[PDB]
């Protein structure tokens, strides 16, 4: 949100859940942010680097968090044969 | 009634976790240690504190008691937490698997020493 001459007049831009694309508000205290470690050629984690995800409180409370991470992980290559689209 | 209060139960508890080697199974000796080991404000309280401690040494003789840990018992505890058999219970003594279990091995594509046996409800 900008003003008549291009200046951003918004306090801050909130994140959004990966599984649902909904805003993660300030006091959504069930929400999480996972970090998945990348691996060098020798099969060892690379310090300080991740493939990051966020999941909203709603998803986690319904029990869909496990399935939604399987979808996202497999897409990004972090898993091979965990998720099948046809149920 | 002969129910001790918490100021006695806890004072005796503190003595055992810090002075197990020196306590004995005898009231009179334990009476004199509590004078050299703790500062107590009366003859009456001092007798009661020592009396319970004797009672607790008797318990520890027959077996360990919940709520009291001391240098000797914890050392013998950790020693048996390093136990491990000669051969794993997972190691092969001869592996059997159901028919459906066998199908799973095939799908994954692993070669294993499978024996199949029948199964029913």
């Amino acid at each position: 949100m900008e003003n008549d001459k291009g200046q951003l007049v918004e306090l801050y831009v909130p994140r959004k859940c990966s599984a649902t694309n909904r805003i993660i508000k300030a006091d959504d205290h069930a929400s999480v942010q996972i970090n998945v470690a990348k691996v060098d050629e020798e099969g060892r984690a690379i310090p300080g680097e991740y493939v990051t995800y966020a999941l909203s409180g709603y998803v986690r409370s319904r029990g869909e968090s496990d399935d939604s991470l399987n979808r996202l992980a497999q897409n990004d290559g972090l898993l091979k044969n965990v998720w099948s689209y046809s149920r | 009634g002969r129910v001790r209060t918490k100021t006695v139960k806890r004072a005796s508890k503190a003595l055992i976790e810090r002075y197990y080697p020196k306590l004995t199974l005898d009231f009179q000796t334990n009476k004199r240690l509590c004078d050299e080991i703790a500062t107590i404000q009366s003859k009456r309280l001092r007798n009661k504190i020592a009396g319970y401690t004797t009672h607790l040494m008797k318990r520890i003789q027959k077996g360990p008691v919940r709520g009291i840990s001391f240098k000797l018992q914890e050392e013998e505890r950790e020693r048996k937490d390093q136990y491990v058999p000669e051969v794993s219970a997972l190691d092969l003594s001869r592996l059997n698997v159901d028919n459906q279990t066998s199908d799973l091995v095939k799908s994954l594509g692993l070669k294993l020493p499978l024996s199949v046996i029948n199964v029913s409800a």
């Binding site: 909130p14 300030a26 995800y53 | -």
Partner: protein, 216 residues
């Protein structure tokens, strides 16, 4: 003096967290009232109402007091706090602390053209506590805060300049009207508008990038 007892409290004193926007952005829990006031030193407080309350015992009525407090910046941050205590002074003192721990932001946009600075809410929002329902609609410039005396104070201490309000239900219970207004105004950041549709990368949590400093 102050000695932290939580990871966020340590980083804030050490200066690694400088603005309150990082806390809201990552939704970190706040459990030390010193964190809020080291980042928003401009807060001003207000006690809305004080009422007595009694329970029954064999030897008569046990009387204790209830105080409501609102703290805010008049620049986009507010909080609401209620405490019950044996003395009136204590209820107020503890109410300021509970209110501060619950500071939330607000989203201010325009009613018409995007000329000048924001002056009103970005969208209609509703809030409900008990039976009271407070609804805020955008209003043009020069309208002012069209609301009852109790709710007007909360909106002034939030930074909204022009706003309409409609209420339904038993408004006379002031704790529920102020709670309903507080929920309604915080929902302004939950509502997704088309100007946020863009995808932004997730920032790395401050508690991870300054990991060593948080430990001690």
């Amino acid at each position: 003096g102050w000695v932290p007892v939580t990871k966020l409290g340590r980083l804030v004193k050490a200066g690694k967290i400088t603005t309150i926007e990082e806390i809201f952005l990552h939704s970190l829990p706040v459990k030390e009232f010193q964190i809020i006031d080291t980042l928003l030193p401009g807060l001003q407080d207000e006690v809305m109402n004080i009422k007595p309350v009694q329970k029954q015992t064999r030897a008569g009525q046990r009387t204790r007091f209830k105080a409501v407090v609102v703290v805010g910046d008049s620049n986009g941050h507010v909080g609401l706090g209620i405490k019950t205590a044996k003395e009136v002074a204590g209820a107020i003192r503890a109410g300021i602390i509970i209110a501060k721990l619950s500071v939330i932001p607000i989203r201010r946009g325009y009613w018409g053209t995007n000329l000048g600075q924001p002056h009103s809410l970005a969208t209609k929002t509703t809030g409900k506590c008990g039976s009271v329902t407070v609804r805020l609609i955008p209003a043009p410039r020069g309208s002012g805060i069209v609301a009852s005396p109790a709710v007007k104070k909360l909106l002034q201490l939030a930074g909204v300049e022009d706003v309409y309000t409609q209420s339904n239900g038993k408004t006379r219970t002031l704790e529920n009207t102020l709670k309903a207004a507080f929920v309604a105004i915080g929902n302004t950041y939950g509502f997704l508008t088309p100007n946020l549709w863009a995808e932004q990368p997730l920032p790395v949590s401050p508690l991870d990038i300054y990991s060593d400093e948080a430990s001690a």
